[PDB]
Symmetry: C2
Subunit: 124 residues, 2 copies
């Protein structure tokens, strides 16, 4: 709980913005110190800011990202949003369609994050 539906809308919209510019440390800061990330969902959860920062640094360490639909928020501090990421793999432009689901804590920080996507969502 804590963040209202509107606040969730704002936090998740900002996440996309941070990912887009690639500000790794600002992204990490949005996460609870002990948050867990599953990206893609189905893979082992990654625990803690050190591990999360290493994760984003690997992926974002050249990439554009934008919402492709509005954020769907709840009244219990959770939300979901659809988005697309554009990256350059092997010097070639690729697109990845994803849907992120997040649960925030009483301090407005991301406690849980789950990114839904597979190969079928990747394209050029």
């Amino acid at each position: 709980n804590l963040p209202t539906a509107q606040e969730v809308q704002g936090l998740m919209a900002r996440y996309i913005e941070l990912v887009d510019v690639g500000d790794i440390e600002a992204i990490v800061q949005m996460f609870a110190d002990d948050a867990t990330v599953e990206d893609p969902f189905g893979q082992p959860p990654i625990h803690g800011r050190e591990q999360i920062a290493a994760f984003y640094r690997q992926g974002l360490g050249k990439v554009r990202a934008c919402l492709t639909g509005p954020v769907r928020a709840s009244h219990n501090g959770c939300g979901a949003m659809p988005f697309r990421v554009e990256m350059v793999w092997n010097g070639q432009p690729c697109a990845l369609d994803v849907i992120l689901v997040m649960r925030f804590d009483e301090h407005g920080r991301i406690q849980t994050m789950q990114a839904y996507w597979s190969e079928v969502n990747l394209s050029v």
Copy 2:
């Protein structure tokens, strides 16, 4: 969680199709006996076929629905999709997250949305 990524895409797309035509019996058949529905997510879990059937009865019992983006599937039998529901004259943007069992039936259904996502 046996259903593959492509099979999840198909099942989730069929669900939307069924909702769009309003075939409650067909929709309910898609769920497993132990299934739980959280719609909107944040509201108490609904379980029991008679209960899930009654939930759809009240909602679809003129309603239309369409995918507004591709289904995002995983390899552990789960998927998420963005869609729009038109009903009463208004529109609602939703995102459904679902987990299927080893039989390809809905085990978990979670629909995210709130008043903000509503448009009249």
